[PDB]
Design a protein around this ligand. Sequence first.
Ligand SMILES: *C(=O)[C@H]([C@@H](C)O)[C@H]1C[C@@H](SCCNC=N)C(C(=O)O)=N1
Length: 269
Amino acid sequence: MLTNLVAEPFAKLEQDFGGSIGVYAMDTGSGATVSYRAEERFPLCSSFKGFLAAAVLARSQQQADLLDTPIRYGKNALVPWSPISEKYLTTGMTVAELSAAAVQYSDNAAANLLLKELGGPAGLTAFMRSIGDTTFRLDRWQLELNSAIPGDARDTSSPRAVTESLQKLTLGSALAAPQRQQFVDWLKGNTTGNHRIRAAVPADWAVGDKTGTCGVYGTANDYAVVWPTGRAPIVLAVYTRAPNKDDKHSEAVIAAAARLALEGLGVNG
Ligand SMILES: *C(=O)[C@H]([C@@H](C)O)[C@H]1C[C@@H](SCCNC=N)C(C(=O)O)=N1
């Protein structure tokens, strides 16, 4: 009854893109939603790292010393796109610092170290199951998890489940209040999303997000919590893919889909 009260031209947008776009957006005040391909699976790519940091925070509720624990690593941990952890190879970083790097710079070495700590892909999947997400699956470590093969359900979720889980973790009760705010603060400090959902959000609204860019099959994504002033927050996810391995992703398409989602919710920007 409250889903897609106002139609938006998502189909034309994905046709111009040459692929598929999946969108879920939730107005947490009224419960109204915008939904387009929202229950289809799309590759997570690096966007799993946000949920990874939330899983670390959940663990820290029972292990008070976890976040400040210092983690040393060898040069063999430094895989492509490890922009923060490469600067601390000779010193180590704390679990909290690795989590922030994974979220805010999509740092691969940091994500791998944290995934190892949580028991690998199955451990992160188990955390998602524990908050009621039955759709998310992480199956591989990097870098193969980003292969984005058409029809492959490994390392995928749906826009809807991503949004529902993000809501639970940032606004709901899945994390204790201090950890919830820390997760929000990490998302707010993300540096990689300025041309995606944030590009559709007025500068005077708060917003946190996590991006993903698989590098193949036109596959890229972003999810975000947005706090418009004077009304309840909006949670949304925008995922893309495309049929050919060399199809390029588009940041502009993600921003445009986010704009349409906000318009469909009647959120004035
Ligand atoms: C995750 O999705 C990427 C991982 C596979 O390395 C990671 C890398 C950057 S984007 C890499 C190329 N940049 C632009 N096309 C990234 C991100 O910021 O989303 N995540």
